[PDB]
Scaffold this motif. Structure first.
Motif, mmCIF file in Angstrom:
data_model
loop_
_atom_site.group_PDB
_atom_site.id
_atom_site.type_symbol
_atom_site.label_atom_id
_atom_site.label_comp_id
_atom_site.label_asym_id
_atom_site.label_seq_id
_atom_site.Cartn_x
_atom_site.Cartn_y
_atom_site.Cartn_z
ATOM 1 N N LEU A 154 -47.704 57.552 -31.162
ATOM 2 C CA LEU A 154 -47.815 58.572 -30.137
ATOM 3 C C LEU A 154 -49.237 59.148 -30.075
ATOM 4 O O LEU A 154 -49.564 59.814 -29.096
ATOM 5 N N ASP A 201 -51.765 57.701 -29.217
ATOM 6 C CA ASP A 201 -52.425 57.094 -28.069
ATOM 7 C C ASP A 201 -51.859 57.612 -26.749
ATOM 8 O O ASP A 201 -52.355 57.199 -25.691
ATOM 9 N N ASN A 202 -50.865 58.514 -26.778
ATOM 10 C CA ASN A 202 -50.203 58.943 -25.544
ATOM 11 C C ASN A 202 -49.757 60.409 -25.666
ATOM 12 O O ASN A 202 -50.510 61.328 -25.320
ATOM 13 N N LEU A 203 -48.564 60.654 -26.197
ATOM 14 C CA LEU A 203 -47.973 61.988 -26.183
ATOM 15 C C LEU A 203 -48.783 62.966 -27.038
ATOM 16 O O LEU A 203 -48.887 64.127 -26.662
ATOM 17 N N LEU A 223 -53.235 34.337 -22.660
ATOM 18 C CA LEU A 223 -52.449 35.091 -21.690
ATOM 19 C C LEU A 223 -53.258 35.509 -20.473
ATOM 20 O O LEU A 223 -52.674 35.899 -19.459
ATOM 21 N N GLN A 232 -40.219 52.007 -26.828
ATOM 22 C CA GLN A 232 -39.398 52.791 -25.889
ATOM 23 C C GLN A 232 -40.126 52.974 -24.543
ATOM 24 O O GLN A 232 -39.540 52.700 -23.465
ATOM 25 N N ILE A 233 -41.391 53.365 -24.574
ATOM 26 C CA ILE A 233 -42.165 53.477 -23.355
ATOM 27 C C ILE A 233 -42.321 52.061 -22.809
ATOM 28 O O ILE A 233 -42.348 51.080 -23.561
ATOM 29 N N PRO A 234 -42.421 51.882 -21.482
ATOM 30 C CA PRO A 234 -42.730 50.563 -20.931
ATOM 31 C C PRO A 234 -44.037 49.979 -21.476
ATOM 32 O O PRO A 234 -45.051 50.672 -21.568
ATOM 33 N N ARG A 235 -43.977 48.678 -21.844
ATOM 34 C CA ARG A 235 -45.109 47.952 -22.381
ATOM 35 C C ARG A 235 -45.071 46.506 -21.897
ATOM 36 O O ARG A 235 -44.067 46.063 -21.349
ATOM 37 N N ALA A 236 -46.166 45.774 -22.132
ATOM 38 C CA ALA A 236 -46.162 44.333 -21.980
ATOM 39 C C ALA A 236 -45.224 43.716 -23.017
ATOM 40 O O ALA A 236 -45.384 43.965 -24.196
ATOM 41 N N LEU A 245 -45.449 39.594 -24.906
ATOM 42 C CA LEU A 245 -46.794 39.412 -25.427
ATOM 43 C C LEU A 245 -47.818 40.235 -24.653
ATOM 44 O O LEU A 245 -47.826 40.265 -23.407
ATOM 45 N N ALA A 246 -48.685 40.891 -25.416
ATOM 46 C CA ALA A 246 -49.908 41.474 -24.906
ATOM 47 C C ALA A 246 -51.108 40.627 -25.308
ATOM 48 O O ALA A 246 -51.117 40.031 -26.387
ATOM 49 N N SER A 247 -52.145 40.636 -24.469
ATOM 50 C CA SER A 247 -53.423 40.025 -24.814
ATOM 51 C C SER A 247 -54.008 40.717 -26.040
ATOM 52 O O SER A 247 -54.062 41.940 -26.093
ATOM 53 N N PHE A 307 -57.041 41.862 -28.310
ATOM 54 C CA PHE A 307 -58.448 42.228 -28.245
ATOM 55 C C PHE A 307 -58.839 42.847 -29.574
ATOM 56 O O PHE A 307 -58.390 43.944 -29.892
ATOM 57 N N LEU A 320 -59.639 46.605 -29.847
ATOM 58 C CA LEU A 320 -58.508 47.484 -29.595
ATOM 59 C C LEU A 320 -57.515 47.403 -30.754
ATOM 60 O O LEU A 320 -57.107 48.431 -31.304
#
Ligand code: NA
Ligand code: NA
Lengths: 545, 545
Positions: free
Chosen positions: B112, B114-116, B225, B243-247, B250-252, B254, B257
């Protein structure tokens, strides 16, 4: 590593403070969303009525009846002004970060700063420096619209396409549909209005570059997306525009993450109906462009993005007024089922690319169909957008640029030449130099370029051919000085009246050998310094009976 | 807004420098992936062979036949040690960030941030301070495993469940399948081994808490990808855990990151087969736990996560050696079709929850079935994980804790009491205070709790009942001091042999009124200060014929 003590490298100011726009995203929701959606509904009704009554309907078969205008066939050269918030950092790797086009993309910095360019960003700008902190630095203090237009005129260009709205959604025009515009953020001016006015004064055809999708857009939703969402009824719309896998169609909205990526964008329920369509309509109605250059149409298929409706509108409003043209980037005509089959598995993808007047190969020309009209876009380097590192070693010489241009034109292409200013709006001297050289060459050679068509043969060794529309003038562009004699092997069926080298008024002698070859003695007086007549490429005009 | 001058608030050190682990993710790919996948394949084969030959098969029907062990029915109280890298920042909002459970989650800080929790993180730690920069700060300098075990013993607990591996994948044990482990990162010790040794010394049942999925995991892929991917053949596996929407899936990948989010994790081809299953097996084989506490089973359905195979294995390796138990968090038995129908549209979701020996209500007890075995997990506040802000206003008193505990036990529950140390491993004094009160209460009253079962009535006004498993003792837990007389309205069919207040040796006389009520005069010498005998709740033991 990435931070230099080179004055040319844009970097974090010692006086940096976070840019917190007067209106937060939530403020814009509370104060402007309803107003904008109300305005949008009335504008979309008007657009839909124009299309219902017009010659052009929003479907592939109706739009296909539109023709490439004569002016676009004839133009051969345009200027593509790649300027926006990304111009401030002015960075991509010189090598190793090329896209599938072969280009590199400083103008993707606003997106790639969070991933591919994150190490650079963190070292040079800071992890606390967000996308929107580039907006106040886009000062335009050195951006003079009329001088840019005069530079384009002097270069030999016949159209000018400003990056009116790129993928992060900053508009070069003062829009009623977003506060992320050039008046509210950055230079404090309607840059597009200035460029349109300059184009009128210098009789230049004007484009409208428009990213269909944006990387992120705040949208109004009935249901939230997770138990963590802090703000009721707002989410972030994302489609395929970003290319990397992401949450689609919606990501959870978190102000501390998103606000400083989307400053100025007013939340709506339907990105396409409530924002994209009316903002397209607004710019077309206000500025009356000659050309629409869609981009970012891979975000969503046209069944969703509704770009067949914007295209029909553009053509309908031009009827009886002016001849206009659209590129081929509106988006895909594929069904959901065919899009699924593409993902599971290029053949099918191309079958769904059915909208537009001309092709748009990017950087790499590739296997173009020379029977149809096409346009290649590129700068003098691989970089789309300013790269502070670009230099003599990384950029085409004037010589190379002119020879590439000739090749393009012989093969039925236009060159849409990208020029990339810095954050202040100053054009790097190296780009200005190459424009100067191209313009100086065109002053001598333009009649062999403008208003011409491909010949039955495009290339013979170091020679590229074009012809006048009527077929009575053949132009032989020699990329090597032919020396004492110019010999042409390709058969010429018609009788010849005479031959000249553009840049000299003297008529050249010529004979046909019995095998058919053309022999053209070149005066001794030209051999000492042929570059006095024309630099780099020497063009011979053959007048036919 | 978030940075205080309070010394109790954990915050960025003036001596901070980035933690760049000696093995990058790419180094681990090159140097360790093959070895781990070699070992994984062999361990999966062994596990599958054990299940083929064993009593329990990896299917819902076979596993359902496994019963709750007597010891778990009898235990009533466990300690849940919520300690990990999140313990360093020790933050959630006191109010307004509750999950659907009603709890708040300092122990989600790694995700969290990175967001909340990003505004807090940026202000207190810094945007340049990444998830993995917490790992070196998890020093354990104040963490003594024997002391924690004795705290559990002295509190009256009968099982101890460390957070052996939470959602970001740091293991408390020394694992050959990850370098994100307590020996290589953080305290420099096999924390789990120390706790297991202490549990053996003090005859405590030991749990194994295990997050099935992790928020991000580096995986080896055939195809990349996107055109932006910098590293061939690596990507990031993500499922529904976040829980939050994500790729997904698979995500690319990096490095700039991801590397400082996933330090220590060795890339594999198949997260479940090559990492999850063998690491589960490793811990079970090495440490021989009595209890498996799955968590994060909502990431992927069990058809994909394969947790029926780990469950069958756990039972099979214990069969004939010890009686063991599993919670109900392995994941969903739903088909892909039913998972789709759930997303499109709770009834269907619950129908797919079919694995485990007991229920695990979290913070909110809700409408529990008291006929089956259940366990509520919670700390003395809403916070799962250390919250530096937790205080008297935010936390249950010892009194409230004891009364809630009695209610739980009368209703067939266990309490799995969360205790949350700081980054050094020190337990906050407020938590120590509540444990002191609970343990002092249990020293007098534990015979009325351990080894008991619900009675025919659970509650009569302020009184909660339990019975001895042999049926010969009824325990009446009075949450108010009864005063001069204890009157019990609920009929007692059996003859009464004797009555005592736990904490006093005095035999209490009684009469039955004509209406049937039991009337028990309470000695005068108890009336002035009954809290000396037992605080908050007074338990009367009624011996039956
Ligand atoms: Na057409
Ligand atoms: Na069972």
């Amino acid at each position: 590593k990435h931070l230099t003590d080179n004055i040319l490298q844009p970097k974090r100011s010692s006086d940096f403070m976070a840019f917190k726009y007067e209106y937060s995203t939530v403020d814009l929701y509370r104060e402007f969303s309803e107003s904008i959606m109300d305005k949008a509904r009335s504008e979309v009704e008007i657009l839909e009525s124009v299309n219902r009554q017009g010659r052009y309907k929003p479907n592939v078969e109706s739009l296909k009846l539109h023709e490439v205008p004569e002016w676009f066939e004839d133009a051969k050269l345009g200027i593509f002004l790649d300027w926006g918030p990304w111009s401030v950092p002015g960075y991509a790797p010189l090598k190793g970060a090329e896209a599938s086009t072969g280009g590199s993309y400083p103008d993707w910095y606003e997106f790639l700063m969070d991933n591919l360019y994150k190490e650079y960003h963190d070292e040079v700008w800071g992890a606390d420096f967000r996308r929107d902190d580039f907006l106040p630095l886009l000062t335009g203090e050195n951006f003079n619209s009329e001088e840019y237009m005069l530079l384009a005129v002097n270069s030999g260009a016949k159209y000018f396409v400003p990056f009116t709205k790129h993928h992060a959604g900053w508009t070069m025009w003062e829009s009623e549909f977003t506060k992320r515009n050039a008046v509210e953020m950055g230079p404090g001016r309607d840059i597009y209005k200035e460029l349109i006015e300059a184009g009128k004064k210098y009789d230049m055809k004007m484009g409208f570059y428009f990213s269909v999708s944006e990387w992120e857009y705040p949208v109004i939703v009935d249901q939230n997306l997770s138990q963590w969402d802090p703000v009721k009824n707002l989410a972030i719309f994302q489609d395929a525009l970003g290319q990397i896998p992401r949450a689609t169609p919606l990501a959870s909205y978190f102000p501390a993450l998103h606000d400083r990526m989307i400053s100025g964008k007013i939340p709506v329920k339907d990105y396409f109906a409530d924002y994209m369509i009316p903002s397209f309509k607004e710019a077309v109605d206000k500025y009356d462009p000659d050309l629409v250059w869609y981009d970012g149409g891979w975000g969503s298929p046209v069944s969703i993005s509704r770009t067949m409706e914007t295209s029909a509108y553009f053509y309908n409003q031009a009827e009886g007024k002016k001849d206009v043209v659209i590129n081929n980037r509106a988006g895909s005509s594929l069904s959901e089922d065919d899009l699924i089959k593409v993902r599971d598995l290029m053949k099918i993808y191309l079958s769904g690319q059915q909208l537009g007047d001309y092709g748009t190969p990017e950087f790499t020309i590739g296997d173009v169909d020379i029977q149809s009209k096409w346009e290649v876009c590129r700068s003098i380097s691989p970089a789309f957008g300013y790269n502070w590192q670009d230099d003599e070693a990384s950029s085409l010489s004037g010589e190379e640029l002119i020879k590439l241009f000739v090749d393009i034109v012989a093969n039925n292409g236009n060159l849409l030449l990208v020029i990339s200013p810095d954050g202040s709006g100053k054009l790097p001297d190296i780009q200005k130099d190459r424009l100067l050289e191209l313009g100086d060459w065109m002053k001598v050679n333009a009649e062999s370029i403008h208003n011409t068509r491909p010949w039955k043969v495009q290339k013979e060794n170091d020679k590229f051919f074009t012809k006048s529309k009527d077929g009575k003038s053949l132009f032989v562009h020699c990329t090597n000085w032919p020396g004492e004699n110019l010999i042409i092997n390709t058969p010429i069926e018609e009788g010849i009246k005479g031959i000249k080298l553009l840049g000299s008024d003297i008529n050249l002698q010529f004979t046909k050998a019995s095998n058919g070859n053309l022999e053209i003695p070149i005066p001794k007086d030209f051999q000492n310094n042929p570059s006095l007549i024309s630099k780099y490429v020497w063009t011979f005009k053959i007048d036919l009976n």
